[PDB]
Scaffold this motif. Structure first.
Motif, PDB file in Angstrom:
ATOM      1  N   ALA A 171      -3.398   7.687  11.507  1.00 29.74           N
ATOM      2  CA  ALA A 171      -4.956   7.324  11.831  1.00 29.74           C
ATOM      3  C   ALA A 171      -5.718   6.550  11.094  1.00 29.74           C
ATOM      4  CB  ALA A 171      -5.407   8.613  11.990  1.00 29.74           C
ATOM      5  N   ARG A 172      -5.019   5.721  10.182  1.00 29.00           N
ATOM      6  CA  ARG A 172      -5.289   4.750   9.326  1.00 29.00           C
ATOM      7  C   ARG A 172      -5.049   3.327   9.498  1.00 29.00           C
ATOM      8  NH1 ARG A 172      -8.132   5.314   3.851  1.00 29.00           N
ATOM      9  NH2 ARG A 172      -6.435   4.858   2.807  1.00 29.00           N
ATOM     10  N   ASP A 173      -5.786   2.312   9.116  1.00 26.87           N
ATOM     11  CA  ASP A 173      -5.656   1.084   9.353  1.00 26.87           C
ATOM     12  C   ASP A 173      -4.853   0.062   8.082  1.00 26.87           C
ATOM     13  OD1 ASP A 173      -7.552   1.529   7.367  1.00 26.87           O
ATOM     14  OD2 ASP A 173      -9.330   0.321   8.588  1.00 26.87           O
ATOM     15  N   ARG A 175       1.465   2.033  -1.746  1.00 24.31           N
ATOM     16  CA  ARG A 175       0.900   1.256  -2.677  1.00 24.31           C
ATOM     17  C   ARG A 175       1.533   0.793  -3.791  1.00 24.31           C
ATOM     18  NH1 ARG A 175      -1.056   1.009  -7.942  1.00 24.31           N
ATOM     19  NH2 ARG A 175      -2.779  -0.617  -8.056  1.00 24.31           N
ATOM     20  N   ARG A 228       3.098  -2.763  -4.814  1.00 23.51           N
ATOM     21  CA  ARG A 228       2.886  -3.386  -6.009  1.00 23.51           C
ATOM     22  C   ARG A 228       4.102  -4.124  -6.681  1.00 23.51           C
ATOM     23  NH1 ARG A 228      -2.063  -3.145  -3.776  1.00 23.51           N
ATOM     24  NH2 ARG A 228      -3.784  -3.925  -5.175  1.00 23.51           N
TER      25      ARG A 228
END
Lengths: 5, 215, 240, 153
Positions: free
Chosen positions: B164-166, B132, B136
């Motif tokens: 396992a995340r989107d 992230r 940014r």
RNA sequence: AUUGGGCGUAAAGCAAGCGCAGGCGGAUUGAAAAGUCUGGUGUUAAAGGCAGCUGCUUAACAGUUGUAUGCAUUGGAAAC
RNA sequence: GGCGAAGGCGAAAACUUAGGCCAUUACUGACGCUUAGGCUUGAAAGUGUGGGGAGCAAAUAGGAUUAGAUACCCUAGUAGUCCACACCGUAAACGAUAGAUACUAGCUGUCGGGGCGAUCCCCUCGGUAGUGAAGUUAACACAUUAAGUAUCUCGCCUGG
RNA sequence: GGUGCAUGGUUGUCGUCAGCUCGUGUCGUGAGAUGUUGGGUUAAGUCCCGCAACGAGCGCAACCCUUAUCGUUAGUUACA
């Protein structure tokens, strides 16, 4: 709100 | 799933990077098998200068490497202490087959070229950056240049294992109905001790008049 | 005089048996017509209080808005009046999301002005399609939100013919503590609206003279010549 | 203002293929001087939801009384059979409440109060019970004025 | 769950009615004050609850002081 | 739409009867309500006593066909199904919605009395619904005819 | 050499489908709904109408190349 401010 | 963005508008409406022509199946086979390798090896080790691209002009046993570097100071160094080994390594990788005649020139607006952005993102990936925070920072850098809609996508793990995340990003003006949008796309496969991560950057370069035909 | 009883000969009764018992203090006993008639004295006192209040608040240039969305007659009168005097008015319905935020009006008026100056500087140099489309959206957007482009502050008072007829807008006014005048018929709540004006709209004279009187009050509050403040001349208009 | 997150929930919607998560965060903003707000945000990125909830709480601040950092009377709040005990306590004794309750009372700039969190204690239920137990507080002087006889009662 | 629960959709009103004992209580007047609280005295032990103090070379332990609801008797209350 | 506390209830003629509303300036002047237990009523189906054999139908059986069948489609057919008497003393006996008590916006319905008066328009007193206000329940929604407000009364419930 | 539920890319795919969404506001006490909903109109979330929806992205139509009509530079090893 009788008077204006 | 979909065709490459640089394989649809590039080649019929966008300026080429490798522009060369000669007799086929006689010597141009070596040309094709060598120019890609030299271009890749330029980016493999010389990430310090953050070069954008080199235009290859192979016509009748000569090559003209149009070097474009955002910060050629790394290449220049002090009293040209770096161009000597650059010239010698290009000579080794090219042999005595053709002239070198390298050039030096600053490239205008390299931010819209996602190749350098992909290089920086790969460096960040191999430097163990938070995803992230890296996104940014990329957004900050692209808004510094005031560019159009940017799509930064990642394929692979998320500093873990067994994803396992989107994740789903669709941001900015990315018109495909109009063939006058001039959107470029870059992809880079960075390597980490747990595998490979593919970073993809689509950058819109804005509409300009009288486009639709290659300059 | 102001709010005289001369015009109040056809001023009572709007609907039958669809009423709120909480509005009974502002009305007089019913008749066989089943119309909900109005006391003409308490109405006169409330009208005078509202008149002096709006005069005082708009003498300091308080932002005042107009919302008249009746079928053709009251709407046409509001259009003519609000076009004659440079006042803010929204003669169409309310889709919400506008009164709540000034930020939702700033960008809207910026885009409106940008389109206006573009059409002022465009002479079909692009294709006719784009020019006609842009003019079409300008007309469409200005037909609802086009009568108000002189405000730089928040509204301070609203005028509505019937709050239940524009309840959404009332909701947009319920968040703020600003007062509001309304021609409540018989089925309103005297807590979401500050000024209670017992009046009907089934008759042209009542609503038309009420709207004209409010318009003259606002105009004179902006240092403008008086039109109807004590004149006994009852203008004759019929619903059509 | 402290901007302390009070809850984070993993939520999702079901499709015929995959499942689309929209996990939410609930935060409270309180300056400890009498301006309290709570904001929730449902997004796909944890910092994005955090900042959205922070801004929402900042714009949703509502004023509350500051009278010696304690309520001057006992009161029993209730939000759907979820009752909260608000019994005023002497100063310098210590706060005895739930973690969310202690966070709420500290962010409100109040002092030790004899409380207890019974009934349904879902975070939103706790917030509702607390707000119902605090929105009914009045002013003793005003209560005195609201009667024919003035006693400051 | 007498502070401190509910009984339509989570378990929670016998199929319904008469229905005795019994429970509840329509306004007022007189009395007893029967219940109630108060006022006086006494009954309520030792250890131990409560607090002051005390020897415990602070501290465990124990001791002094007054003190824990409640009951008998006596004068009232009219509000219940 | 109604009766009765809940069952249940319509061709007619008659036999005795209650309950139900309204006003009651007339009557006792507290005689009120609920209530463990006990008692009364209590659908439909089943049991025994004689008609019963119009139909239906359990026990079934036949044909059909189920890779499938004490069922499904149709038929021949059995106690019962109806009438009078004893043994039901049982159920979505549910308004999934305890009873009684008094109170709480407003609009649209129904009828009996009261009147105006032709019923017709109107409203008053009672049974009887819908829209809809507050309030509340998580909501559904209830919504002065509450699943609202409070009191009395027993009964029930504390994971399956 | 195994390891494609460790993986990057790649593919046909619903489908050339119009659905999928960003923010703001309103409402819910939250999963969220309003757009995404209804009548027209298109290949179409293209738009209009009514409209708690408002602006915006996404796919869409126009921007690419042959074809029809003409003009233009224009010539063989085309016309001759």
């Amino acid at each position: 709100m009788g008077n204006f401010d | 799933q979909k065709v490459n963005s640089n394989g649809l508008r590039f080649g019929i409406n966008k300026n080429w990077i490798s522009r060369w022509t000669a007799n086929s199946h006689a010597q141009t086979a070596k040309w094709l098998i060598e120019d890609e390798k030299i271009r890749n090896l330029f980016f493999v080790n010389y990430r310090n200068a953050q070069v954008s691209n080199v235009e290859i002009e192979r016509t009748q046993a000569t090559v003209d490497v149009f070097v474009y570097a955002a910060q050629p100071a790394f290449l220049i160094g002090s009293e040209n202490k770096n161009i000597q080994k650059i010239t010698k390594q290009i000579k080794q990788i090219i042999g005595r087959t053709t002239n070198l005649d390298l050039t030096i020139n600053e490239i205008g607006s390299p931010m819209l070229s996602a190749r350098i952005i992909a290089r920086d993102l790969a460096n960040a990936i191999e430097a163990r950056v938070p995803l992230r925070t890296a996104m940014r920072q990329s957004l900050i850098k692209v808004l510094k240049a005031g560019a159009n809609g940017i799509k930064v996508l990642v394929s692979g793990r998320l500093n873990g294992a067994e994803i396992a995340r989107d994740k789903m990003y669709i941001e900015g003006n990315m018109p495909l109905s109009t063939l006058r949008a001039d959107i470029d796309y870059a992809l880079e496969k960075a390597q980490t001790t747990y595998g490979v991560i593919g970073v993809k950057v689509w950058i819109n370069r804005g509409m300009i008049y009288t486009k639709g035909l290659n300059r | 005089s102001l709010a005289k009883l001369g015009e109040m000969r056809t001023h009572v009764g709007m609907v039958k048996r669809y009423w709120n018992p909480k509005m009974g203090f502002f009305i007089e006993p019913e008749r066989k017509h089943n119309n909900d008639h109005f006391v003409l004295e308490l109405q006169r006192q409330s009208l005078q209080t509202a008149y002096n209040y709006v005069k005082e608040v708009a003498q300091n240039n308080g932002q005042i808005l107009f919302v008249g969305t009746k079928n053709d007659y009251v709407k046409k009168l509001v259009n003519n009046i609000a076009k004659r005097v440079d006042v803010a008015f929204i003669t169409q319905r309310w889709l919400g999301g506008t009164l709540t935020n000034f930020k939702t009006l700033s960008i809207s008026i910026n885009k409106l002005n940008k389109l206006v100056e573009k059409q002022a500087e465009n002479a079909a140099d692009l294709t006719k399609k784009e020019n006609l489309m842009l003019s079409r959206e300008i007309e469409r957007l200005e037909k609802f939100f086009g009568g108000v482009k002189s405000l730089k502050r928040l509204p301070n008072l609203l005028i509505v013919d019937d709050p239940v007829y524009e309840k959404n807008a009332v909701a947009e006014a319920n968040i703020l503590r600003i007062p509001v005048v309304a021609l409540c018929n018989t089925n309103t709540n005297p807590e979401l609206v500050d000024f209670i004006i017992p009046a009907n709209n089934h008759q042209p004279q009542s609503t038309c003279l009420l709207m004209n009187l409010l318009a003259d009050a606002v105009a004179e509050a902006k240092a403008m010549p008086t039109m109807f403040a004590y004149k006994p001349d009852e203008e004759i208009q019929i619903e059509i | 203002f402290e901007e302390r997150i009070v809850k984070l929930k993993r939520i999702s919607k079901t499709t015929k293929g995959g499942r689309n998560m929209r996990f939410s965060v609930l935060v409270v903003v309180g300056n400890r001087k009498g301006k309290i707000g709570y904001g929730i945000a449902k997004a796909l990125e944890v910092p994005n939801a955090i900042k959205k909830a922070i801004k929402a709480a900042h714009n949703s601040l509502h004023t509350i009384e500051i009278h010696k950092g304690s309520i001057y009377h006992e009161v029993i709040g209730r939000s759907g059979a979820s009752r909260v005990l608000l019994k005023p306590a002497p100063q310098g004794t210590g706060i005895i409440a739930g973690g969310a309750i202690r966070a709420i009372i500290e962010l409100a700039g109040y002092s030790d109060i004899y409380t207890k969190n019974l009934g349904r204690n879902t975070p939103i239920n706790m917030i509702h019970a607390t707000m119902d137990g605090i929105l009914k507080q009045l002013s003793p002087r005003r209560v005195a004025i609201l009667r024919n006889k003035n006693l400051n009662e």
